[PDB]
Design a binder for this molecule. Structure first.
Ligand SMILES: O=C1NC(=O)/C(=C/c2cccc(C(F)(F)F)c2)S1
Length: 274
């Protein structure tokens, strides 16, 4: 037990998710990320198959661990008297999608197609494991720059998937749907689909469409960059004001704009410099 197992590197960041450090597992020099969450800031707890009391985040992360690389894998976790510490895999070299967009601005459609498809695959995997992420956005997406594989990260706002209404939310407001804003009610899939529309707009325009409650509620989308008609249509469909008017994951992936995606490795070659 205990961290003498890990050699702590530099702080990667800190925020509403806690404090995350670059690290290395001493027993094989495997890159990890070490994430400390304060007990005070955990509103949401569950219990595992094992059945002890842990943060919901840990429950959700265990439900999605697998060799499938589109979601971050929890390697281990530790309790401390005032915090939980989590050990997560860390690709290297790596860059989050927010920073990549800061650097390169609006993305070419072929590249956005490739990234967005990989995001769809990740989210379908989560829904499949009975998990609803509830904070899909560019800051929660890591790009493995060598392999061109994206990774969804940060389940600290997620919940067990269910088919009844959610009336609670602690993810990102500007990615949250009109129904959350107006009624504090949404269903899991359709709220997830709206945030995927925000995300895809973000990729192709270089920023999110809406900053204020009023704009979200209005749902009117203005394109500030040149974007093909097939792409604007997919976006405007993901951002239908009525939840039931939103596409399912399968309709998103059968959309004409989504055809002939590059493979992750082709993507890194053409676009990331491999
Ligand atoms: O599941 C997760 N929850 C978080 O807050 C994470 C932060 C993180 C931030 C930058 C880099 C990485 C790294 F994995 F690349 F290191 C991880 S990961």
């Amino acid at each position: 037990p205990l961290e003498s197992q890990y050699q702590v590197g530099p702080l990667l960041g800190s925020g509403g998710f806690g404090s995350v450090y670059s690290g290395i597992r001493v027993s094989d020099n495997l890159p990890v990320a070490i994430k400390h969450v304060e007990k005070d800031r955990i509103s949401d707890w569950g219990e595992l198959p094992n059945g002890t009391r842990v943060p919901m985040e840990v429950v959700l992360l265990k439900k999605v661990s697998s060799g499938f690389s589109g979601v971050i894998r929890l390697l281990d976790w530790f309790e401390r008297p005032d915090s939980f510490v989590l050990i997560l895999e860390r690709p290297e070299p790596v860059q989050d999608l927010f920073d990549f967009i800061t650097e390169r601005g609006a993305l070419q459609e072929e590249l956005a197609r490739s990234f967005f498809w990989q995001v769809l695959e990740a989210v379908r995997h989560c829904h499949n494991c009975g998990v609803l992420h509830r904070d899909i956005k560019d800051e929660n997406i890591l790009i493995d720059l060598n392999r061109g594989e994206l990774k969804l990260i940060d389940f600290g706002s997620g919940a067990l998937l269910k088919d009844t209404v959610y009336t609670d939310f602690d993810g990102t407001r500007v990615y949250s749907p009109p129904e959350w804003i107006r009624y504090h009610r949404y269903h899991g899939r359709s709220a997830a689909v709206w945030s995927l529309g925000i995300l895809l707009y973000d990729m192709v325009c270089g920023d999110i469409p809406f900053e204020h409650d009023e704009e979200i509620i209005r749902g009117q989308v203005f394109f500030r960059q040149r974007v093909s008609s097939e792409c604007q249509h997919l976006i405007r469909w993901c951002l239908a004001l009525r939840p039931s008017d939103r596409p399912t994951f399968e309709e998103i992936q059968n959309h004409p704009w989504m055809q002939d995606v590059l493979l992750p490795q082709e993507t890194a070659e053409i676009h990331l410099h491999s």
